[PDB]
Amino acid sequence: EYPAHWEADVVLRDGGTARVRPITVDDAERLVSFYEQVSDESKYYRFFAPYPRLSAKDVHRFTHHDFVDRVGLAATIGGEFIATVRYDRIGAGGTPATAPADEAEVAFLVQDAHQGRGVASALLEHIAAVARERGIRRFAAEVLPANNKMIKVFMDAGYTQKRSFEDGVVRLEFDL
């Protein structure tokens, strides 16, 4: 259960629309179908290891949210998912947390056919707007250094690179 106004239409850079809405427990089929149309390369960049098909654990977690500490949204075109975005509230220790912990890790995945259309940009804006309503004050994104296109998406969304203290990962942060 979630506020109805978390559902919105977006107009993409080419004037097409997509509906941005929360991911629900009834969306599992849709999520798996969408995932089939994401490249292996995009999956590797999203998960930091090859992951051609989601596990049952992950289909569950990516479709079951409290909508307070974890929020997942989809962009849909003609009812099919084309992208997803999400936040997970985390504690000082990088583990899951509840308020008044106020940082979250943000992640997104776009079907390669819908790249270049401003989908990520629109989802980043929408997940920030939702997150502000749940008390989040900072997002952190973690991106592989090979994945320069997405670094650029984040920077263009107002994120700044920060020291990651970790090998093999670029950290980008955004104050909400």
Side-chain angles (χ1 to χ4, degrees):
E1 207 250 284
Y2 40 71
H5 70 96
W6 286 11
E7 293 167 4
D9 292 306
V10 304
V11 177
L12 293 178
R13 283 177 189 156
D14 56 29
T17 63
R19 170 51 61 100
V20 175
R21 61 174 184 81
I23 301 166
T24 77
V25 298
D26 299 306
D27 284 325
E29 315 153 61
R30 280 180 283 284
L31 188 68
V32 166
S33 178
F34 147 83
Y35 200 70
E36 296 193 276
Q37 307 217 253
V38 180
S39 73
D40 283 323
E41 174 154 19
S42 289
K43 297 165 179 183
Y44 165 67
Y45 288 160
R46 171 65 178 84
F47 291 104
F48 299 176
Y51 198 7
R53 297 181 189 69
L54 298 171
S55 71
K57 181 175 176 164
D58 282 341
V59 170
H60 178 98
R61 68 158 163 148
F62 291 145
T63 62
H64 292 69
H65 311 81
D66 68 341
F67 297 109
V68 179
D69 300 329
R70 296 183 57 259
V71 169
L73 311 174
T76 77
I77 296 180
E80 292 313 299
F81 284 20
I82 66 156
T84 62
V85 66
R86 56 184 62 252
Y87 79 73
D88 287 64
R89 192 188 304 263
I90 55 164
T95 60
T98 63
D102 63 358
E103 309 236 340
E105 290 192 353
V106 66
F108 68 82
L109 186 62
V110 185
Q111 284 182 340
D112 301 61
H114 290 105
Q115 282 163 8
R117 299 190 64 198
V119 172
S121 164
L123 285 179
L124 290 176
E125 184 170 306
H126 199 119
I127 198 65
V130 164
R132 287 186 188 98
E133 288 188 15
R134 294 300 198 243
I136 301 296
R137 293 218 265 212
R138 187 178 279 177
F139 284 158
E142 287 181 346
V143 186
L144 295 188
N147 189 4
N148 57 264
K149 287 211 181 82
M150 294 307 180
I151 300 175
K152 186 175 186 301
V153 167
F154 281 113
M155 288 176 315
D156 285 348
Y159 290 55
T160 300
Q161 294 193 236
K162 307 289 199 183
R163 191 174 165 177
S164 68
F165 296 88
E166 179 170 305
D167 292 309
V169 79
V170 170
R171 179 183 179 81
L172 303 120
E173 297 179 7
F174 179 69
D175 299 300
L176 289 169

